[PDB]
Design a protein around this motif. Structure first.
Motif, short mmCIF file in Angstrom:
data_model
loop_
_atom_site.label_atom_id
_atom_site.label_comp_id
_atom_site.label_asym_id
_atom_site.label_seq_id
_atom_site.Cartn_x
_atom_site.Cartn_y
_atom_site.Cartn_z
N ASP A 193 35.91 75.09 -51.90
CA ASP A 193 36.71 75.06 -50.68
C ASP A 193 38.13 75.50 -51.04
O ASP A 193 38.69 75.02 -52.03
CB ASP A 193 36.71 73.65 -50.07
CG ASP A 193 35.28 73.15 -49.77
OD1 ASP A 193 34.44 73.96 -49.31
OD2 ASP A 193 35.02 71.97 -50.03
N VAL A 194 38.67 76.40 -50.24
CA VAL A 194 39.99 76.96 -50.47
C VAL A 194 40.84 76.87 -49.22
O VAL A 194 40.32 76.86 -48.09
CB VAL A 194 39.91 78.42 -50.95
CG1 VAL A 194 39.51 78.49 -52.42
CG2 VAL A 194 38.98 79.27 -50.07
N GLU A 195 42.15 76.79 -49.42
CA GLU A 195 43.11 76.85 -48.32
C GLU A 195 44.50 77.22 -48.86
O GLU A 195 44.83 76.90 -50.01
CB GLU A 195 43.17 75.52 -47.56
CG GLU A 195 43.78 74.39 -48.37
CD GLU A 195 43.74 73.06 -47.65
OE1 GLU A 195 44.81 72.47 -47.46
OE2 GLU A 195 42.64 72.60 -47.27
N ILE A 196 45.29 77.91 -48.05
CA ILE A 196 46.68 78.21 -48.40
C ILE A 196 47.50 76.98 -48.03
O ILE A 196 47.50 76.52 -46.88
CB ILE A 196 47.22 79.46 -47.67
CG1 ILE A 196 46.53 80.73 -48.22
CG2 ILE A 196 48.77 79.55 -47.76
CD1 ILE A 196 46.73 82.00 -47.33
N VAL A 197 48.14 76.42 -49.05
CA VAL A 197 49.04 75.27 -48.90
C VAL A 197 50.37 75.70 -48.29
O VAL A 197 50.86 75.08 -47.35
CB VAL A 197 49.26 74.57 -50.26
CG1 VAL A 197 50.32 73.44 -50.14
CG2 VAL A 197 47.95 73.97 -50.79
N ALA A 198 50.96 76.76 -48.85
CA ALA A 198 52.24 77.28 -48.35
C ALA A 198 52.47 78.73 -48.75
O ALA A 198 51.98 79.19 -49.78
CB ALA A 198 53.39 76.41 -48.87
N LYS A 199 53.20 79.44 -47.89
CA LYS A 199 53.70 80.77 -48.24
C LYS A 199 54.91 80.57 -49.14
O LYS A 199 55.62 79.56 -49.01
CB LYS A 199 54.12 81.52 -46.97
CG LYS A 199 53.77 82.99 -46.99
CD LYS A 199 54.21 83.71 -45.72
CE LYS A 199 53.90 85.20 -45.83
NZ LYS A 199 54.83 86.03 -45.04
N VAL A 200 55.14 81.50 -50.06
CA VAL A 200 56.25 81.40 -51.00
C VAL A 200 57.09 82.68 -50.97
O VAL A 200 56.60 83.74 -51.39
CB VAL A 200 55.77 81.15 -52.44
CG1 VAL A 200 56.97 80.88 -53.34
CG2 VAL A 200 54.77 79.95 -52.53
#
Length: 263
Positions: free
Chosen positions: A146-153
């Motif tokens: 399972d994957v997800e973007i936590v935050a843009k940097v």
């Protein structure tokens, strides 16, 4: 070499890693040691794989303050990860290694990884089925984790400033969810169908038949026979490759493997 300089993004990555003093963390790249320090503070022990020996002053200084850091001087794509006892990975990755490192790590296994990638790569990793960014990478990762973007940097978080945004991505391996019959075959199957992502699975498989070591005529006949096994298969193989869900690609490939293992 774009070092992560913004402690706020360090913090976000570390928080997402949900670390405790029973966790052992692999970090890929030392940088300025800001992330390394946060890992050392919160985890049982941190391994740091670093290729640039000019960065050793950062390591030496840290080792004066922490007794639980081990530096491994070398190439993260070459180092035998099987020999290391980590359960988590937290890193600002060197972007060129993004793909091979991700699969090398997943193969090795881990509880949880929190890794920085270039934004476009991250979008591809997490892309939903049937969307414009959905592709082989999306299925190769999501079939296994399972994957997800936590935050843009933003670039301003790094020095020197990169040309594009990065993204922190959380990866939680999940073997049970999809259950792959044969890893080699699944990889071959994915390569074949995503060489023609806007074609039906049937047509992609025929076009790329050599990827599965069949000639085009053999494959056409194979698929006619395969389609006759149940109605679900017919509807799956007639759909466009990029419109199939991860679940459906894994199931289809599993059923196809079994069908072919009949010789």
């Amino acid at each position: 070499q774009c070092f992560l300089i913004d402690k706020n993004f360090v913090n976000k990555a570390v928080e997402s890693a949900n670390l405790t003093k029973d966790d052992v963390v692999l970090e890929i790249g030392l940088g300025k040691g800001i992330l390394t320090e946060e890992l050392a503070k919160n985890a049982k022990k941190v391994y740091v794989i670093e290729i640039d020996k000019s960065l050793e002053p950062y390591a030496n200084k840290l080792k004066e303050l922490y007794n639980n850091i081990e530096i491994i001087w070398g190439d993260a794509l070459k180092v035998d990860l099987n020999k290391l006892d980590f359960n988590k990975v937290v890193a600002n990755l060197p972007y060129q290694i993004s793909s091979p490192i991700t699969f090398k790590l997943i193969k090795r296994g881990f509880d949880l990884a929190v890794l920085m990638y270039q934004y476009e790569f991250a979008k591809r990793m997490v892309a939903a089925a049937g969307t414009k960014d959905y592709g082989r990478l999306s299925v190769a990762v999501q079939s296994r984790a399972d994957v997800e973007i936590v935050a843009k940097v933003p670039p301003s978080a790094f020095y020197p400033k990169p040309k594009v945004y990065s993204a922190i991505v959380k990866i939680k391996p999940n073997k049970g969810k999809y259950h792959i019959e044969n890893e080699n075959f699944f990889d071959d199957f994915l390569r074949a169908i995503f060489q023609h992502r806007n074609k039906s699975v049937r047509k992609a498989l025929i076009d790329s038949s050599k990827e599965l070591n069949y000639n085009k005529d053999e494959m056409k006949k194979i698929l006619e026979d395969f389609l006759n096994t149940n109605s679900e298969i017919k509807n799956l193989i007639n759909e466009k490759v990029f419109k199939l869900s991860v679940k459906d690609i894994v199931n289809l490939s599993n059923e196809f493997y079994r069908f072919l293992q009949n010789r």
